[PDB]
Amino acid sequence: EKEQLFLQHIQNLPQERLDAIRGHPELVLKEIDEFTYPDGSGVRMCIGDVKGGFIVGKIRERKPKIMVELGGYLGYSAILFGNEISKIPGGRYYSLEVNEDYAKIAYELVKLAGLDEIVTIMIGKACDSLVELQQKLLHFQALDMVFIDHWKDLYVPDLRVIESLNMIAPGTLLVADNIITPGAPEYHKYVNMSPEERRGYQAKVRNVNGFDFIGRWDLIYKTETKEFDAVDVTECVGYAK
């Protein structure tokens, strides 16, 4: 709706502006950042300068070959992080977006930014796309980096899907947005739980995504909260006894 207005804006840009920004990720991000709706508001879910720079720093430091985003909206994150992923040989970025309308817009922006061969947008429920992605990757076991910024109540349910799919291993980094506002106490709690506390959590809390996505309790997590507005930075550092 409101999102279609932004797409229309991009599509009705002068040929000279499209030519100037095509294939240039930072320039495309700037067009998204500078757009204003009739009511004066901006495009939602643009990643801020400092936080973006923080997550980019992590990508540059750890050089994930496979980065997955739970969420995606209109392509901002996929363009910012996918651009860094494009610097890494073999790098792929997967954006798992449930709203099909949004994903169609993010696709156009990702394409305009020149990131189409690197960035795949998977449409549908995150847990379904994770199952599909794992199976596709099998035909290497774990994800290198996961960016989590969709609906707060699916943070733990989807993480448990990833764990159950064995896509978390030592070296895997989880970066979860909006921990404080509004934000996501349950996820913050889960990744700070010991392996035994999570053993019991999993037996007690049914996963809404499906019963057999129980999770994996024997993963050792080390979590740090960065404030700017806060993100949880969780590294899998080992397996429990």
Curated annotation (Swiss-Prot):
Coiled-coil regions listed in the entry: none
UniProt binding sites for Mg(2+): 149, 177-178
GO CC terms: cytosol; nucleus
Cofactor notes: Binds 1 Mg(2+) ion per subunit.
Catalytic activity: a catechol + S-adenosyl-L-methionine = a guaiacol + S-adenosyl-L-homocysteine + H(+)
Keywords assigned by UniProt, alphabetized: Catecholamine metabolism, Cytoplasm, Magnesium, Metal-binding, Methyltransferase, Nucleus, S-adenosyl-L-methionine, Transferase
Compartments reported by the entry: Cytoplasm; Nucleus
Broadest EC class assigned to this enzyme: transferase
Stored InterPro entries: SAM-dependent_MTases_sf, SAM_O-MeTrfase
EC number, UniProt record: 2.1.1.6
Binding site for S-adenosyl-L-methionine: 47, 69, 77, 97-98, 126, 149
UniProt record, GO biological process: catecholamine metabolic process; cellular detoxification; methylation
GO terms, molecular function: carboxyl-O-methyltransferase activity; metal ion binding; O-methyltransferase activity
Record: residues binding substrate: 152, 178
Primary residence: cytoplasm
Keyword set includes Cytoplasm: yes
Cofactor: Mg(2+)
One protein family per Pfam: Methyltransf_3
SUPFAM superfamilies in alphabetical order: S-adenosyl-L-methionine-dependent methyltransferases
Similarity remark: Belongs to the class I-like SAM-binding methyltransferase superfamily. Cation-dependent O-methyltransferase family.
Name of this protein: Probable catechol O-methyltransferase 1
Organism: Schizosaccharomyces pombe (strain 972 / ATCC 24843) (Fission yeast)
